[PDB]
Amino acid sequence: SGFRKMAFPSGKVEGCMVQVTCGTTTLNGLWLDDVVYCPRHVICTSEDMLNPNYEDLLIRKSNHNFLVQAGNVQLRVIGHSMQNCVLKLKVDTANPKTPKYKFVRIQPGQTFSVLACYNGSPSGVYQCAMRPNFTIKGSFLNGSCGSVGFNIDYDCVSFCYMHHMELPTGVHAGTDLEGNFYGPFVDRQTAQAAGTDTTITVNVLAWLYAAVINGDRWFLNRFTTTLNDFNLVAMKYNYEPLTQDHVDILGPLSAQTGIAVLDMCASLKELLQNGMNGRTILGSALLEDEFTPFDVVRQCSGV
Amino acid sequence: SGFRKMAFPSGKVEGCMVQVTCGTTTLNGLWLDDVVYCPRHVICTSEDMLNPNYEDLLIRKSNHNFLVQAGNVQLRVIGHSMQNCVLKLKVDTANPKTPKYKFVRIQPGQTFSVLACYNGSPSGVYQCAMRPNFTIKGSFLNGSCGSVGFNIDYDCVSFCYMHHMELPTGVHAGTDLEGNFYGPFVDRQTAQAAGTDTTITVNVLAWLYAAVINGDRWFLNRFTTTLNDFNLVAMKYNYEPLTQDHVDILGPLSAQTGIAVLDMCASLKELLQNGMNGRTILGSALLEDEFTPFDVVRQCSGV
Numbered sequence A, B: 001s002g003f004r005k006m007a008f009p010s011g012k013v014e015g016c017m018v019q020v021t022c023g024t025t026t027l028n029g030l031w032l033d034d035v036v037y038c039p040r041h042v043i044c045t046s047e048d049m050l051n052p053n054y055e056d057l058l059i060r061k062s063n064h065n066f067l068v069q070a071g072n073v074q075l076r077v078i079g080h081s082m083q084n085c086v087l088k089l090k091v092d093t094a095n096p097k098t099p100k101y102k103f104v105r106i107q108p109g110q111t112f113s114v115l116a117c118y119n120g121s122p123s124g125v126y127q128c129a130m131r132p133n134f135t136i137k138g139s140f141l142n143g144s145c146g147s148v149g150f151n152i153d154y155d156c157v158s159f160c161y162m163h164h165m166e167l168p169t170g171v172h173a174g175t176d177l178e179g180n181f182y183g184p185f186v187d188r189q190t191a192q193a194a195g196t197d198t199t200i201t202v203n204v205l206a207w208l209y210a211a212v213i214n215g216d217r218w219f220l221n222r223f224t225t226t227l228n229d230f231n232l233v234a235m236k237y238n239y240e241p242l243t244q245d246h247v248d249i250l251g252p253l254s255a256q257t258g259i260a261v262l263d264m265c266a267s268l269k270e271l272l273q274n275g276m277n278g279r280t281i282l283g284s285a286l287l288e289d290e291f292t293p294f295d296v297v298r299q300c301s302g303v
């Protein structure tokens, strides 16, 4: 029993973190086989942060402009190239700790574990969700760029995020490991801001099922609702529409608890319209939306 | 910027987890040097869960009654002994992945990272606090016994918790790594229940400072309070008394924000008496008490 925001064990990723320096800028790199991946903005000066032509800046760089340190071992860069907003630094040594891995891009509403790093050394690990507006609500200080987000399936690491920047609202923006940004953000200095966010309805329902599995039942009721009547209420409260695919995805949790999905939707409608009246669910006074149905099943296996 | 419940990187501990079987019971063990540590209740049958004499049960056991598997490598047990509520199984091989480590017992109000494991294999990592009533609010299913809690300082792992059981309220109980329980709990089947808990006041104040550092300021006010007038209110709301040592410990966060500790106490008194009126702090609608002053400083270094 119990339900916590749980990250994947970080060991396999810790073995891939290195330190990358160019000029006076130091950040983190990801060392897989004989390539080190890092944010391309490592090559910029703050004389260049305004309208950097990254192509121009990179043609002016050489292999020896990049210092890569793995612990207290210097790796020799023997090649460099740009892949969208990430740099690929070919080094003379394959990482002996390379796990089985994939580069996957995730969807808004999906979760992943972040290994926050500074100077190539891991600091902590926590769980994030990709928001509908393609930001993440993380914990990142200067020097954290190049920290990565990931999921593990059996013992294959699916890397899905590399950290690049913080927005004025305090949320965070980055790329997949092919260097393609999540969302309409750019690695150049603008007034860029997060677009309007919404609540991930299917996740809130998943977390309500987690609560039932863990013995929190006070929000349940007799009522059921139609999918269309629910979505009418969800729209009003800045919740994403619930699709029939979402209903299908919640099937296993519905079966385990004996609570039909549209029954739980009726509980959610009442929570949205009346609040909790000073009660809590799984220790929270807010409806939580950063647990996927998978996060719930994986953690609530046998309560 | 940003503030998250952050765990320590788990790599150093993942390398120490093994699987321990005795009879039909399998749980997790911690493999350090040539010793494997696990809960002594591994030797019990459910014919014995009522009033086990652990001394009696252990004298009837032999080395070959204990199967220890490290990945897909069998370790030979060459010695066994009881240390309070933990078993020490001497094995024929020192763990080559043994980190620098300490066995430390923590205080209520302190935090640590838990590496949840099943069958010797890590599942996830999350942060816990030791509650004033010596329980922890974790996420543990059957098979998780022997999972450990820990902190890291530089690259020394201070193990502080081994998991033994779940209470009827859904909270969790265990021992330090010397086998001594936290709290008045026993590894035998009783009606044992958690005593009454309280809120960790110094941690709530630390988290309010974290919020200010991260730009949440709406709860601040002009008022200051005396320590005694604050503690009068804290008592009324099931908060622990604030000591002058607590005030001193909050010094660095007070200096960084320019907000005197007794000023923040006045904010807390008002929050306790009036609630938040539908606002949130660092994403929470409740006052959070599972971040220590250290957790805040370490994470909010340079905002």
Ligand SMILES: *C(=O)[C@H](C[C@@H]1CCCNC1=O)NC(=O)[C@@H](NC(=O)/C=C/c1ccccc1)[C@@H](C)CC
Residues within 6 Å of the ligand: A027, A041, A049, A140, A141, A142, A143, A144, A145, A146, A164, A165, A166, A167, A168, A172, A186, A187, A188, A189, A190, B001
């Ligand atoms: C790389 O380590 C940093 C990480 C940032 C630093 C600020 C604190 N939190 C982080 O995640 N990346 C950068 O410094 C990039 N720029 C920004 O993050 C922009 C911050 C900002 C600018 C203007 C208004 C509000 C906020 C640099 C590399 C440019 C892409």
Ligand SMILES: *C(=O)[C@H](C[C@@H]1CCCNC1=O)NC(=O)[C@@H](NC(=O)/C=C/c1ccccc1)[C@@H](C)CC
Residues within 6 Å of the ligand: A001, B027, B041, B049, B140, B141, B142, B143, B144, B145, B146, B164, B165, B166, B167, B168, B172, B186, B187, B188, B189, B190
């Ligand atoms: C070891 O893996 C388990 C872990 C438990 C199992 C239940 C689910 N969550 C856990 O943490 N330890 C035990 O099974 C011990 N007993 C209990 O946890 C008691 C559960 C309980 C009993 C009576 C009323 C309410 C709850 C065994 C080994 C006895 C110490």
